[PDB]
C-alpha cells in the first residue's frame, strides 16, 4: 500500500539528485580535486542502491518473482554501499588530515592518478568483502503459502563469525581512523593563525573541511543505528545478556527501520551538497 508508494518516491528523488550531481561533476572531469573525485565515487556507489529500489517495491507489493540472481545482486549492492561509503569517507578524512596538520599533500603534486588507484583499491576491497553475501543468498521458496522472500542461508555455524567480522571491519577501522584524524584536525585548527601563509588559500580550506565534516556527520547519523542493531544481535547470539525470546519482534522491526534509514541516506546526500556550499 503505502510502502510501494514511498519506495517509488525515494527511487525518483534519489535517481534525479544523484544523476544531477554526477553529471555536474563529470562535466569538468578533465581535472578534479581529491575531494571532488571522492564525492563523485561515493555518488556512483549510491546510484546503484537507488536503482535497486523498484525490486523491493514490487517485493513489498505482492511477492519476489525476479529470481536468485537478482536477489544476490540486490543483497550485494546493499552490503557494498556501506563499505564503499565508509572506506571513501575514511580516505577523504585522512586526506584532510594530511592537508591540515602535516601540510605535505601529494595527491595533486605527486603521481598523476594516486587517487584513482586508491578508489580502485577500495572498490576491490568492497567486492572482496561482499563475496560472502554473493555466495550465500538465494530465493528460497520456504514453503510458506507462496512466500518466496529473499533471505540469507547459512550453515548457522559461521553466521556469528561473518557478522562479527563485518561489524569489526566496516565499523571499527573507518571509525577509529576518522576519529583520530578529526581529533588531530580540530586540535591543530583551534590553535593556529593561518593555514599555510595566505588569506585566500586558508578560507577555502576551512570551507572544504566544513563540507566534508557535515557529510561525514550525516553519514554517521544515518548508518549508525543499523550497526548498533547488528551489534545487539551479535551480542545476543553470543549468550551475553537479555536473551529472553521476547525481543525478536523488536530486533526485526529495528532491522527493518534501520534498513529504511540507510536507504534514505541516498537521497539525503544530494540535497546536502545542494543547500550548503551552493
Amino acid at each position, epitope marked *: 500500500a503505502f510502502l510501494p508508494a514511498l519506495y517509488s518516491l525515494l527511487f525518483l528523488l534519489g535517481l534525479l539528485g544523484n544523476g544531477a550531481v554526477a553529471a555536474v561533476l563529470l562535466s569538468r572531469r578533465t581535472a578534479l580535486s581529491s575531494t571532488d573525485t571522492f564525492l563523485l565515487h561515493l555518488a556512483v556507489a549510491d546510484t546503484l542502491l537507488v536503482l535497486t529500489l523498484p525490486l523491493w517495491a514490487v517485493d513489498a507489493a505482492v511477492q519476489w518473482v525476479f529470481g536468485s540472481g537478482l536477489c544476490k545482486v540486490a543483497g550485494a549492492l546493499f552490503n557494498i554501499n556501506f563499505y564503499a561509503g565508509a572506506l571513501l569517507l575514511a580516505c577523504i578524512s585522512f586526506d584532510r588530515y594530511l592537508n591540515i596538520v602535516h601540510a605535505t599533500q601529494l595527491y595533486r603534486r605527486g603521481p598523476p592518478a594516486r587517487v584513482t588507484l586508491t578508489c580502485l583499491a577500495v572498490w576491490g576491497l568492497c567486492l572482496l568483502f561482499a563475496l560472502p553475501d554473493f555466495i550465500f543468498l538465494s530465493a528460497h521458496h520456504d514453503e510458506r503459502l507462496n512466500a518466496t522472500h529473499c533471505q540469507y542461508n547459512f550453515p548457522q555455524v559461521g553466521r556469528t563469525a561473518l557478522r562479527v567480522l563485518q561489524l569489526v571491519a566496516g565499523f571499527l577501522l573507518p571509525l577509529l581512523v576518522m576519529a583520530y584524524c578529526y581529533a588531530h584536525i580540530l586540535a591543530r*585548527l*583551534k590553535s593556529v*593563525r*593561518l593555514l599555510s601563509g595566505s*588569506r585566500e588559500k*586558508d*578560507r577555502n580550506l*576551512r*570551507r572544504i*573541511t*566544513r563540507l566534508v565534516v557535515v557529510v561525514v556527520v550525516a553519514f554517521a547519523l544515518c548508518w549508525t543505528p543499523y550497526h548498533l542493531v547488528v551489534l545487539v544481535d551479535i551480542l545476543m547470539d553470543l549468550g551475553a545478556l537479555a536473551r529472553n525470546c521476547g525481543r525478536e519482534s523488536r530486533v526485526d522491526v529495528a532491522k527493518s527501520v534501520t534498513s529504511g534509514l540507510g536507504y534514505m541516506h541516498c537521497c539525503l546526500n544530494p540535497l546536502l551538497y545542494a543547500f550548503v556550499g551552493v
Partner: nanobody, 114 residues
C-alpha cells in the same frame, strides 16, 4: 560586528608618560594580533607575547596584553611634542571556527604633547 573601546588620550604636560588602553568586544571566536598605528606601526603584540616595534621606536614604548579581558595597553614614557599625532587601534579576529581571518580598525585617538 566588533566594538573597540579606546581610552587614555587627552591633555598632558611635556616630558611625561601616558597609557593608551584598547579593548575589543562582540561575537568573536578568537583574537590573534593587536597593535597601534599612526599609517605605520608603532608597537605590535601577538598571542604568544612576542613584541615588534617600528624603526622609529628605540624600545621606549612598552606594549602589554591581557587575554582574560582581551585588552591591550601601550605605555609611552618621555613624550615629545613630535609625538602629537593620531593613533588607531588595530585587531585581527576570527568570528567563527570556519570563518576567514579579518581585521577591524578602531575609531582612533589624538595625542598632543606641550
Amino acid at each position: 560586528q566588533v566594538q573597540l573601546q579606546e581610552s587614555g588620550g587627552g591633555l598632558v604636560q611635556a616630558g611625561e608618560s601616558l597609557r593608551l588602553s584598547c579593548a575589543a568586544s562582540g561575537t568573536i571566536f578568537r583574537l590573534y594580533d593587536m597593535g597601534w598605528y599612526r599609517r605605520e606601526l608603532v608597537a605590535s603584540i601577538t598571542s604568544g607575547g612576542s613584541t615588534k616595534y617600528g624603526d622609529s621606536v628605540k624600545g621606549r614604548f612598552t606594549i602589554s596584553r591581557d587575554n582574560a579581558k582581551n585588552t591591550v595597553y601601550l605605555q609611552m614614557s618621555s613624550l615629545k611634542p613630535e609625538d602629537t599625532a593620531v593613533y588607531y587601534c588595530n585587531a585581527e579576529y576570527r568570528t567563527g571556527i570556519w570563518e576567514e581571518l579579518l581585521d577591524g580598525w578602531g575609531q582612533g585617538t589624538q595625542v598632543t604633547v606641550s
